[PDB]
Design a protein around this ligand. Structure first.
Ligand code: CFM
Ligand code: CLF
Ligand code: SF4
Ligand SMILES: [Ca+2]
Ligand SMILES: [Ca+2]
Lengths: 260, 522, 476, 522
């Protein structure tokens, strides 16, 4: 029963890759659960009532039934969305804390799953780090690009890992690159002391499926990009490299970029 | 003016003519006060059934609450452990208030620290505060254990208590083996009782979760007793007494009876007595575990049944005759010890008292409030006495609780004019005692204001307060009473008949008017 | 006692870790009355060291608890979870005349009692709804204040917009106070935020307004919270002196009094710490001068009356001498009865931001000397004023920890201690007479001449009480 | 008229207009009642200092006494022994009254018989009544002992109890070996307390006087404890508790705790517990003997010192802080048992309560009454609390007692406005609280009438009754209280401050009038 957290810059295709990956995973016969914890995106729209909205409606979290929140989708993937305020108000961070707590307390993780995937938003506070506390996610994968602000984000996340790593059992499982950019991200990983678990090529089919509310695996199982996600899935299922990252300086970053 | 040998304090000083006149000039001259006729009109309206519909239609406003926040219960739970300092992670205002609140009720010192999180710690996280705070508290106040709870500010920003404490140990601020159990206690969830449950479970976890492999159920031959949020010292005492009387080996988990009652002998003792660390470590070896206040010990029950593998008995709070009988017989069953002649006789003496006083208690109507277990045991007792608990309010109660208490009310003819209100406050109840007037209210000190309001409407409409619950700030040493067991039931019964008789003597004290019924014997 | 207090300080500090050791060192000192500048002797108003059992409160306690809360005809809303509101509900004895729940609301607790969903979704819509509810249920209120608790400040709840829209709509003055508990380091910043909220939303309401009939003798009591009726016992003297007291700041204060305060001739400031901000503001905007006074004990009351009357004409000065003479027989009776019962007794004090230096003269009128004094949250300007009022080799302590105070008391061994509820039962246990100098141990007044009678009565009943002779068992 | 679902008792039925006009027609029509203005004029007069002088100049009339007659105490004394039937030789009216008086106070059955002496027995002596009665009682009620006291009728005619019982045994009415102790208890000598002293000495004599030669002092290694006339069940209980706690071997001579507090379990127990015949017979073998109420145990002391050769300690009643300390140190001295940590801590907790509450107790003035030992110890505790016992009244007190109490008051500044009145009654005391008004009265149920008189004068003149003493007929289960030891001291203190606070809350409950001082925290 492996719990994994997925962080990365959203303007890339963080949510889309997470879902295509989980779809490939479910396709291999793996029982997966996706937990949406990203206010800046829709984490289950491709696989398919949030915990927070359902709670308010029923009064409180204590009045919530797991069946009201968990819904099965493609490949039998179980989906749960934390929920959160509308834009510019409230506190989405606490919404994540509450949702995860509810899932813990309502025995959602003890059903016999193979994987749990947290699709997390930018760690701007403790609440969005809820997924990487003890007894939660042990494996962290960051989706990145050759863009600067995209690699810098990869580092900030690593610094956040380091912090919770010295305190418990949580490691960086590697980098996933959404399309010499191929080489750049590889060096970024070597610097971090981890790896680039997979280079997801650019392919219009992903958008085609995405705009039609599907992952490539469901949209077109025979597509070449479909096999790319199946390749990522296998590399994740067999991955054994979990590490505590060695963040770099923005200077060291401008050096790496300037070398390409 | 003041005469040196008959000095007046605020009452009756301000009732003197020069002050009364000055106050009148302040009002007419600068206060722009609404005319008394308008003040009188609005008051009468706040008394009507029309105002009551409006009052009960509130969905955003809360006026005069009958509950407090989680951390307060957390501090009390932690005080029940040997040489432990309750530590609240977050801002300090909370702690000053927690301490003050308990000082005023117990009339004793209450020790608790904060790590004083300020505006920059709200923005950066309270990790540094936790490192230095744990180090300073251990070095200065020297406890054997520090029990960490939280204030809302630290809960909003998601300060990971577990990581923060582990990093504190890792960096050398406190020893790796120094006990530091923790519990996230959000103000905005539940109430003070939930804080107790979270903290107790957090300590239970700390001392037993890892060590479960060498534990055998029933091997130490004791029964664990988990008290819950308890502010009556006599309740810790009566349970310990009844079990020792039976020869029942027990372990009371969270016992603040000694710290909250040290002697004024010349020295201040910050710590006194309490459940030892070893009693908590050895707890899974017990025959079973009895939770005295089950309706707010739900997370604890789940850890005890889940991890300790104990079959916690479905037992209600031991208040009143039936539930005390049930408690003793269950304790008898589990331990193998028979209920002794002493307790049997004590039971008959409470029944004796009931047969002596039933005449005055019959059909007496009561408005009452408090925490869910207390208020439920009280309803049951009142019902055994032939009394009608007309208005039952539990601000912090939930839907299942209301069902349970409605079931109890359904089982007796005395609970037929009774309604249970959850999530309602004392301003809601203020209305209830105005529109459907009972004979007395049984609640805490905040109900003295409801009595004041009912008396302003008139002497006939006045509903007297019988001070039972928490907090009692306006009377002294009531925190020494007993509410639990037959002992507690006898105390409660005496207070109720004598409040009834006190009130009757008051209404019959009029010379040649009502004193024809001012009887010597009652 | 000259170097015995310095070695004491060092000996006490020996128990702290190094970081806390160096910070507390500069917060403790020995007095030298020749030190007009306290910053080379003691620093203050810095944050509390974590885990050392400070006695301090928060910004909310300063705003809601002490400044806004006393204002009788407004409804003050503790915005956030149920806690703050409950603990501060009627804990401070800020007296008032009014019909509670109808036209006065001081002892009541109005809260938004935040639940998880108000934290996550935000509570501005809940606030707006709450304001409509206090309007139908408490129609006679003359204004509303919104007192922020910690969560409101993190979550970014735009409460001033809610206050603006609901206030314009209902034709009500609704004041938003950003007094969330983590701001600042104590109650002190809460005073400041509250003073600013008063000027920005209430004080200038009657600015272009010339309806009020002014008199050359109009004054305002600023910073008297009427604990036990302290302000009423102070204005009886002021008004017998011929002055007209148009306003009382917060103690039994009304919103109209506050609005009418810019119309006066003089602001008489009792509590310098909590309201010097609004006074200074009234000087630069309305031109109203202000002066500090002390109504604790006869020597100070007499001095104060004379200084206050000297700002006016000869008729007020003549009435000033009339009042001093009127009460002279009375306070001399109190001195004659209780001073012999109290002479030479030593007192250690530790209160808020004004009493630690303000009650000194009153204790000295009974022949008692203050051997130690300190503040929870005062700034250096309060300590500047403290050097003249204290004796030479005495102990001074800012934001004293539970440990420090206990040990200082163990060395010094005072006959009486004056502090709050959180330390009361610690020293009674230790056999030392204790008087609450915040709540007056439910007695009061202590202000003015009639208050002095009660003060002396109280110090005597506690210090020379028969229980203190019985702490030790005759068999040990 | 009566509404079936809101039935009114005497109060408030007679306040209805049809009864109020009916009553007025009875008064104006056939009562020839003095005009109200004359009734109010004389009331006012009975309030003055002028009336007080006349009142205190009485030498023949006694109005509203604060004492009862000898046999009552004799009946209580006898009930303290195992399976003994109190037997009162004389007229039966006495017994009916003794029983009714005690039933109403303890709310229990009190067993006692008379030998019902009629007019002819008044003329011929009660010798036949003694013969029949002892036979009838022993056979019907089956006691193991019959303890004989006397009514005044039998005392005036000099019925020799010793002869009559000896002749009863000789004629075969009762066996020769059947225990029948006696005591002449004249109603016109002393009071109920003297009757207890007399009855106790009679039982001590019966069992020990002939047996003295084989007795050795201190050989059974116990301390006998003689309680005296005691009507608070908590007092027998606290003394037995504190001695057992110290590990002191003792024997309580006259112990009615069990008979006066039987359980309502399904059966009626006429007898229960008590001091055994053997404890009485073995009594001279004790280390010493401690009399708890020495001022009414003088004859007993003379027999114990003269007869048993015991060196009775000069000990006051153990009420209050100092006299409990003294009692404990004396029992420690005699027994050799140290005073344990539990009692040391209990003393510190009473002192703690005193420091917590001194602010409200200080300078509070009290009028009080009761039996000599009780009122003596009440005065000392009030003094230790900082209160002024301004009017101390003891109808059944003597000159030497007044001396001792004056010595107590002269040793403290709080007794500088106090006066002690012996041989005076409640009509005398009624005047004292009118002319020199105190804050409260501490007395029995008879003071409820003084309270109604002071209230009639007006609210500011009302002196509230705090019910401590015997008899308490208008409240329930107060007989279960404790007056002795630190425990009793804690109960009295709580009752005093809370009475002060209840009264203060009433005085400041006036909306917008006096409620500025109606504080939540006190
Ligand atoms: S501890 Fe006054 S600066 Fe402030 S509530 Fe008490 S020593 Fe305050 S005098 Fe005052 S009425 Fe006070 S006593 Fe200034 S208002 S924050 Mo706690
Ligand atoms: S500094 Fe949240 S509910 Fe109110 S006591 Fe708190 S845990 Fe409880 Fe000051 S503003 Fe208030 S008392 Fe901020 S939270 Fe403490
Ligand atoms: S940064 Fe996080 S903890 Fe702070 S208000 Fe926003 S979502 Fe909440
Ligand atoms: Ca105490
Ligand atoms: Ca009975």
């Amino acid at each position: 029963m492996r719990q994994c957290a997925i962080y990365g810059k959203g303007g890339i295709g963080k949510s889309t890759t997470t879902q295509n990956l989980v779809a490939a995973l479910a396709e291999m016969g793996k029982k997966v659960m996706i937990v949406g914890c990203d206010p800046k995106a829709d984490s289950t729209r491709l696989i398919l009532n949030t915990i927070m909205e359902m709670a308010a409606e029923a009064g409180t979290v204590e009045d919530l039934e797991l069946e009201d929140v968990l819904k099965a989708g493609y490949g039998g993937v179980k989906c749960v969305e934390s929920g959160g305020p509308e834009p510019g108000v409230g506190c989405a961070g606490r919404g994540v804390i509450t949702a995860i707590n509810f899932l813990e307390e309502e025995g959602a993780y003890e059903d016999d799953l193979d994987f749990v995937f947290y699709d997390v938003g930018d760690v701007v506070c403790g609440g969005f780090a809820m997924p990487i506390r003890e007894n939660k996610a042990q494996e962290i994968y960051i989706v990145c690009s050759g863009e600067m602000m995209a690699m810098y984000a990869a580092n900030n996340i690593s610094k956040g890992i380091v912090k919770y790593a010295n305190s418990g059992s949580v490691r960086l499982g590697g980098l996933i690159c959404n399309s010499r950019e191929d080489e750049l991200i590889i060096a970024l990983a070597n610097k971090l002391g981890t790896q680039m678990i997979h280079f997801v090529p650019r392919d219009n089919v992903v958008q085609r499926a995405e705009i039609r509310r599907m992952t490539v695996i469901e949209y077109d199982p025979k597509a070449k990009q479909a096999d790319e996600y199946r390749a990522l899935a296998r590399k994740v299922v067999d991955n054994k490299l979990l590490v505590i990252p060695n963040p770099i300086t923005m200077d060291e970053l401008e050096e790496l970029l300037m070398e390409f | 003016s003041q005469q040196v040998d008959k000095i007046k304090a605020s009452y009756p000083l301000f009732l003197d003519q020069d002050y009364k006149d000055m106050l009148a000039k302040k009002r007419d001259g600068f206060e722009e006060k609404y005319p008394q006729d308008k003040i009188d009109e609005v008051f009468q309206w706040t008394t009507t059934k029309e105002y009551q519909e409006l009052n009960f239609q509130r969905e955003a406003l809360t006026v005069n609450p009958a509950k407090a926040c989680q951390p307060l219960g957390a501090v009390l739970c932690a005080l029940g452990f040997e040489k432990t300092m309750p530590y609240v992670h977050g801002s300090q205002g909370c702690v000053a208030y927690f301490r003050s609140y308990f000082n005023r009720h117990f009339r004793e010192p209450v020790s608790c620290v904060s790590d004083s999180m300020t505006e920059d710690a709200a923005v950066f996280g309270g990790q540094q505060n936790m490192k230095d705070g744990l180090q300073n508290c251990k070095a200065t106040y020297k406890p054997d254990m520090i029990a960490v709870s939280t204030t809302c500010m630290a809960e909003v920003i998601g300060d990971d208590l577990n990581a923060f404490i582990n990093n504190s140990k890792k960096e050398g601020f406190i020893p790796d083996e120094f006990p530091v159990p923790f519990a996230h206690t959000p103000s905005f969830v539940g109430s003070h009782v939930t804080g107790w449950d979270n903290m107790f479970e957090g300590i239970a976890r700390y001392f037993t979760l890892k060590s479960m492999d060498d534990k055998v159920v029933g091997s130490n031959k004791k029964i664990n007793i988990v008290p819950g949020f308890e502010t009556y010292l006599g309740n810790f005492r009566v349970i310990k007494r009844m079990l020792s009387e039976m020869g029942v080996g027990y372990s009371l988990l969270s016992d603040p009876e000694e710290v909250l009652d040290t002697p004024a002998d010349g020295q201040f003792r910050m710590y006194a007595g309490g459940t030892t660390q070893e009693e908590m470590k050895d707890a899974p070896n017990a025959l079973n575990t009895v939770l005295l206040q089950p309706w707010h010990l739900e997370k604890t029950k789940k850890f005890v049944e889940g991890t300790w593998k104990h079959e916690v008995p479905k037992l209600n709070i031991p208040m009143g005759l039936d539930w005390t009988d049930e408690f003793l017989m269950k304790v008898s069953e589990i331990s193998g010890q028979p209920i002794p002649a002493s307790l049997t006789k004590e039971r008959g003496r409470l029944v004796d008292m009931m047969t002596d006083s039933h005449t005055w208690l019959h059909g007496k109507r009561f408005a009452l409030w408090g925490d869910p277990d207390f208020v439920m045991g009280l309803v049951k007792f009142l019902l055994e006495l032939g009394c009608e608990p007309v208005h039952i309010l539990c601000h912090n109660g939930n839907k299942r609780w209301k069902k349970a208490v409605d079931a109890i009310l359904a089982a007796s003819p005395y609970g037929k004019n009774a309604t249970v209100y959850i999530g309602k406050d004392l301003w809601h109840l203020r209305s209830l005692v105005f529109t459907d007037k009972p004979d007395f209210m049984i609640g805490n000190s905040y109900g003295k204001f409801i009595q004041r309001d009912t008396l302003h409407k008139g002497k006939e409409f006045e509903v007297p307060l019988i001070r039972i619950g928490f907090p009692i700030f306006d009377r002294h040493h009531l925190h020494r009473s007993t509410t639990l067991g037959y002992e507690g039931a006898m105390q409660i019964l005496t207070t109720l008949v004598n409040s009834i008789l006190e009130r009757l003597d008051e209404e019959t004290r009029g010379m040649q008017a009502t004193d024809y019924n001012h009887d010597l014997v009652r | 006692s000259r170097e015995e207090v310095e070695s004491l300080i060092q000996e006490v500090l020996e128990v702290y870790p190094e970081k806390a050791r160096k910070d507390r060192n500069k917060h403790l000192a020995v007095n030298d009355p020749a030190v007009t500048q306290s910053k080379k002797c003691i620093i203050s108003n810095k944050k509390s060291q974590p885990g050392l059992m400070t006695i301090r409160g928060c910004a909310y306690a300063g705003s809601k608890g002490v400044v806004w809360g006393p204002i009788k005809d407004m409804i003050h809303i503790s915005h956030g979870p149920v806690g703050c509101g409950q603990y501060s509900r009627a804990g401070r004895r800020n007296y008032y005349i009014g019909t509670t729940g109808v036209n006065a609301f001081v002892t009541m607790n109005f809260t938004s009692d935040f639940q998880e969903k108000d934290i996550v979704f935000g509570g501005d819509k809940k606030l707006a709804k709450l304001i409509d509810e206090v309007e139908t249920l408490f129609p006679l209120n003359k204004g509303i204040s919104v007192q922020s608790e910690c969560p409101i400040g993190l979550i970014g709840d735009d409460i001033e917009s809610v206050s603006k829209v609901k206030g314009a709509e209902l034709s009500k003055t609704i004041v938003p106070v950003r007094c969330e508990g983590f701001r600042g380091v104590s109650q002190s910043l809460g005073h400041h935020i509250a003073n600013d909220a008063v000027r920005d939303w209430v004080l200038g309401k009657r600015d272009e307004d010339t309806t009020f009939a002014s008199t050359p003798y109009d004054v305002a009591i600023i910073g008297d919270y009427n604990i036990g009726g302290d302000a009423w016992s102070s204005r009886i003297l002021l008004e017998e002196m011929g002055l007209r007291c148009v306003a009382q700041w917060s103690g039994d204060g009304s919103i109209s009094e506050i609005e009418l305060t810019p119309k006066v001739k003089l602001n008489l400031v009792h509590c310098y710490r909590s309201m010097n901000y609004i006074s200074r503001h009234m000087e630069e905007k309305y031109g109203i001068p202000w002066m500090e006074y002390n109504f604790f004990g006869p020597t100070k009351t007499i001095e104060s009356l004379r200084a206050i009357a000297a700002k006016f004409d000869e008729s007020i000065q003549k009435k000033c001498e009339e009042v001093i003479a009127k009460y002279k027989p009375e306070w001399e009776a109190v001195v004659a009865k209780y001073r012999p019962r109290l002479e030479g007794k030593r007192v250690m004090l530790y209160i808020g931001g004004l009493r630690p230096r303000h009650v000194i003269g009153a204790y000295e009128d009974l022949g008692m000397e203050v051997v130690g004094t300190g503040y929870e949250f005062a700034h250096n300007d309060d300590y500047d004023r403290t050097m003249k009022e204290m004796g030479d080799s005495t102990l001074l302590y800012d934001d004293v920890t539970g440990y420090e105070f206990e040990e200082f008391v163990k060395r010094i061994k005072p006959d009486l201690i004056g502090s709050g509820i959180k330390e009361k039962f610690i020293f009674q246990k230790m056999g030392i007479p204790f008087r609450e100098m915040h709540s007056w141990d439910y007695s009061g007044p202590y202000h003015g001449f009639d208050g002095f009678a009660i003060f002396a009565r109280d110090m005597d009943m506690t210090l020379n009480n028969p229980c203190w002779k019985k702490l030790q068992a005759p068999w040990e």
